């Protein structure tokens, strides 16, 4: 049973219409004020809808008005048909259209072909635990359309390893020769103690007998975890000679059970929630990118984290708002002599056998508190109920107030980190975890750190390990760290959802944001010089069309659009 395929099909088509309008891949025609037509490329289909244009070029399209008329016959709204009707106007090379359609069809089956069993109403979710929310997510990246290709997964691999399935599998472990492997950790973390807390006495012993019965000494090796897919699809075949020759040794599966997170390749220990997340190499293609991990990065990522942790260690403002970071505390990476020989850096043959551990947040929260992916604010249940509003009702706060506390919990530390420390991260729904109390916002945790951080002003003793992360940028576009990364890439999507549902009009939303930024600026007069340098109340900033990059991905200097400016919603209150 899947009673709801058309509900999601219309949602999807609506997102395509509004994202592609926003990026001006689709410029519709105004027939009356507020009433629009979009013509198909073959001029056979017409797409009629009413829409309100909210702040940041947000097309809020009335689904009840949305009509599809082909040769004068009225048709069901269909999202795939919509992309095909538009492939030309979108600048998709005819060479590329079948490949794109595959990516996008897989994206769409997540919502549409979801069994009715795995559907949870919004109000039940609002009191669900952390990981239920995690698997009930289906929206994906709010900006990109073809956002869940998972190119590489069979239909079973989706069943077992995709987040929205909710599987609880084990990790396969292997022994890798210490001479072919790079281990690393932050200060305070060591291999011998990490592996103890992670696997325990019995397991470590079991792995060890495996190893000694093969006549091998467990001291020549590290143990490291492997995603069961990556093992069978890539390691067992590509490293076939090494497994033969005993440099890689299967040793079995760990007892604990894991749940994939929205990242797919980051899994959460559900058996022992305070043990670490594990991030594994998954050589599949999702939003144009491969999800392998170079051993090259494995060397430096724990080091970059140690730097960041000691810059922000002891920060009184961050402590006062409760802002945590959860770090990648240790990484491990296998290098193959023959394969490293015949390959330039960045090769996927160097991103196969890697893994890194990351702190779980669970110990840092009260028993009455609740964790949730930030992506949950953009969640809407199959009955059309926005999960965000179930948090607002439960909370005992008005929507406006709820929003204000949310912004303090999330926007304020992001700003501070960019203006006090000149750090930019990726503050999007997947990389933030909200801490709620009975539904009210409390504070926030940032998660994806070593691979995503931009340092704009490192001291003279920046460890060379973080040279990857250093990155000059013009003062003219420094404010994009909030204005595009946060305002246009996330808050814009929250504002439409709150306005369409009547919970908060687009105007009250941005008036709040404006008062939010002002209150932060007033809490930090010693940064007033920087606030003038990098103008958060600038009147316009340039768009960065997410879906264009994919339809061709990721410095902002070379992504910004030349002749598309976005009108800064909060500038009106400067």
Residue 525's Cα: distance from chain center in Å? 33
Query: How does strand 324-325 pair with strand 354-358?
Result: unpaired
Q: What is the C-alpha separation between 416 and 439, in angstroms, rounded?
A: 25
Residue identified by tokens 């994206």 is 107
Q: What is the C-alpha separation between 75 and 83, in angstroms, rounded?
A: 15
Q: What is the C-alpha separation between 253 and 169, in angstroms, rounded?
A: 10
By C-alpha distance, which of 101, 88, 112 is closest to 145?
A: 101
Q: What is the C-alpha separation between 137 and 126, in angstroms, rounded?
A: 13
Name where the chain breaks: residue before each gap, C-N > 2.5 Å. Answer: 552, 554
Q: Solved by what technique?
A: X-ray
Please provide residue 424's backbone torsions phi and psi, each rounded to the nearest 5 degrees: -115, 135
Q: Is 109 helix (H, G, I), strand (E, B) or coil?
A: helix
Q: What is the C-alpha separation between 541 and 487, in angstroms, rounded?
A: 11
DSSP string, 426-466: --STTTEEEEEETTEEEEEEE---TTT-EESS--TT--GGG
Q: Looking at the chain, how many residues does it have? A: 574
Q: What is the C-alpha separation between 38 and 52, in angstroms, rounded?
A: 15
Helix (H) or strand (E) holding 200: helix 191-213
CB 52 within 8 A of CB 65: no
Please provide residue 259's backbone torsions phi and psi, each rounded to the nearest 5 degrees: -120, 120
Burial class (CB in 10 A: 0-12, 13-18, 19+), 48: middle
Q: Which two tokens stand for residue 88?
A: 């030309």
**Portions of the chain given CATH number 3.30.310.280:** 5-117
Q: Which CB contacts under 8 angstroms, 24+ apart, belong to 526-535?
A: 527/419, 527/420, 530/419, 531/419, 533/475, 533/478, 534/418, 534/419, 534/475, 534/478, 534/479, 535/479
Q: What is the C-alpha separation between 80 and 84, in angstroms, rounded?
A: 6
Q: What is the C-alpha separation between 112 and 6, in angstroms, rounded?
A: 8
Q: What is the C-alpha separation between 136 and 381, in angstroms, rounded?
A: 9
Helix (H) or strand (E) holding 47: strand 45-54
Residue identified by tokens 């669900």 is 128
Helix, strand, coil shares, percent, the chain, to 5: 45, 20, 35
Please provide residue 172's backbone torsions phi and psi, each rounded to the nearest 5 degrees: -80, 140
Q: Which residues of 404-443 are buried (b: 16+ CB within 10 A; e: fewer)?
A: bbbbbbbbbbbbbbbbbbbbbbbbbbbbbbbbbeebbbbb
Helix (H) or strand (E) holding 356: strand 354-358
Q: Which two tokens stand for residue 449?
A: 């750190």
Residue identified by tokens 């595959």 is 102
The set of residues, in sequence order, having a beta carbon less than 8 Å from that of 119 and lying 6+ positions away, is: 4, 381, 382
Q: Which two tokens stand for residue 260?
A: 């994939």
Sign of the Cα torsion 555, 556, 557, 559 reads positive
CB 416 within 8 A of CB 516: no
The set of residues, in sequence order, having a beta carbon less than 8 Å from that of 351 and lying 6+ positions away, is: 281, 283, 290, 292, 293, 294
Q: Is 209 helix (H, G, I), strand (E, B) or coil?
A: helix
DSSP string, 262-276: TTSSEEEESSSTTSP
CB 166 within 8 A of CB 135: yes
CB 261 within 8 A of CB 277: yes
Q: Report the CATH fold assignment for 368-573.
A: Transferase(Phosphotransferase); domain 1 (1.10.510)
Q: Which two tokens stand for residue 118?
A: 């795995």
Burial class (CB in 10 A: 0-12, 13-18, 19+), 157: middle
CB 25 within 8 A of CB 18: no
Q: Which two tokens stand for residue 571?
A: 């500038």
CB 281 within 8 A of CB 355: yes
By C-alpha distance, which of 554, 479, 567, 561 is closest to 141?
A: 554
CB 36 within 8 A of CB 50: yes
Q: What is the C-alpha separation between 453 and 248, in angstroms, rounded?
A: 32
Q: What is the C-alpha separation between 165 and 168, in angstroms, rounded?
A: 9
**Portions of the chain given CATH number 1.10.510.40:** 368-573
DSSP for residue 129 = -
Ramachandran sector of residue 535 (left: φ over 0; alpha: ψ -120 to 50; beta: rest) = beta
Q: What is the C-alpha separation between 57 and 308, in angstroms, rounded?
A: 35
Q: What is the C-alpha separation between 150 and 168, in angstroms, rounded?
A: 19
Radius of gyration of the chain (CA): 24
The CATH class for the domain spanning 5-117 reads: alpha beta
By C-alpha distance, which of 375, 505, 392 is closest to 428?
A: 375
Q: What is the C-alpha separation between 409 and 369, in angstroms, rounded?
A: 14
Report the 10 Å Cβ neighbour count for 495: 27
């Amino acid at each position: 049973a899947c009673s709801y395929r058309q509900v999601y099909n219309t949602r999807l088509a609506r997102k395509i219409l509004a994202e592609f309008c926003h990026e001006r891949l689709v410029r519709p025609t105004e027939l009356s004020p507020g009433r629009y037509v979009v013509h198909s490329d073959d001029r056979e289909t017409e797409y009629r809808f009413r829409a309100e244009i909210l702040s940041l070029d947000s097309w809020c399209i009335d689904a009840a008005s949305l009509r599809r008329v082909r040769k004068g016959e009225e048709l069901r709204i269909d999202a795939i048909d919509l992309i095909v009707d538009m492939s030309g106007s979108l600048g998709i090379p005819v060479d590329a259209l079948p490949e794109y359609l595959e990516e996008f069809t897989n994206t769409a089956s997540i919502s549409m072909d979801r069994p009715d069993t795995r559907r949870i109403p919004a109000a039940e979710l609002a009191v669900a635990d952390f990981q239920t929310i995690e698997k009930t997510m289906t929206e994906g990246h709010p900006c990109l359309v073809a956002n869940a290709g998972r190119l590489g997964f069979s239909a079973d691999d989706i069943e077992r390893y995709a987040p929205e399935s909710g599987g609880r599998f084990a990790l396969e472990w292997v022994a890798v020769l210490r001479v072919n492997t790079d281990f690393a950790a932050m200060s305070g973390t060591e291999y011998d103690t990490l592996i103890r807390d992670e696997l325990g006495a019995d397991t470590l012993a079991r792995f060890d007998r495996v190893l000694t019965g093969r006549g091998l000494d467990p001291a020549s090796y590290y143990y490291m975890p492997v995603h069961p897919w990556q093992w069978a699809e890539k390691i067992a075949r590509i490293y076939a000679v090494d497994i033969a020759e005993g440099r890689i040794v299967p040793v079995g599966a760990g007892p604990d059970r894991y749940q994939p997170q929205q990242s797919i390749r980051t899994v959460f220990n559900v058996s022992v929630p305070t043990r670490h997340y594990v991030k594994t190499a998954l050589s599949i293609v999702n939003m144009g990118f491969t999800r392998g991990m170079s051993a090259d990065y494995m060397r430096t990522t724990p080091l970059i984290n140690d730097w960041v942790r000691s810059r922000v260690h002891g920060d009184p403002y961050l402590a006062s708002i409760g802002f945590e970071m959860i770090y990648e505390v240790a990484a491990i990476g296998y290098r193959n002599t023959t394969l490293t020989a015949i390959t330039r850096p960045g090769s996927e043959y160097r991103k196969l056998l890697s893994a890194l551990w990351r702190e779980s947040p669970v110990s840092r929260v009260a028993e009455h508190e609740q964790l949730t992916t930030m992506a949950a604010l953009l969640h809407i249940d199959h009955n059309g109920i926005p999960l965000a509003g179930e948090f607002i009702q439960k909370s005992g706060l008005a929507a406006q107030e709820w929003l204000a506390r949310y912004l303090r919990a999330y926007l304020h530390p992001i700003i501070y980190l960019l203006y006090r420390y000149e750090f930019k991260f990726s503050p999007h729904g997947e990389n933030l975890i909200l801490v709620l109390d009975g539904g009210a916002p409390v504070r926030a945790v940032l998660k994806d750190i070593g691979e995503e951080i931009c340092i704009f002003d490192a001291p003279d003793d920046i460890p060379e390990s973080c040279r990857r992360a250093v990155t000059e940028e013009a003062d003219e576009i420094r404010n994009l760290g909030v204005l595009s990364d946060v305002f246009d890439d996330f808050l814009r999507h929250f504002a439409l959802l709150l306005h369409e549902s009547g919970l908060l009009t687009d105007g009250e939303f941005w008036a709040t944001v404006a008062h939010s930024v002002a209150e932060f600026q007033a809490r930090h007069p010693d940064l007033a010089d920087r606030f003038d340098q990098w103008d958060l109340f600038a009147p316009t900033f340039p768009a960065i069309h997410m879906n264009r990059l994919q339809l061709s991905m990721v410095s902002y200097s070379t992504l910004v659009d030349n002749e598309h400016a976005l009108v800064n919603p909060i500038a009106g209150h400067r």
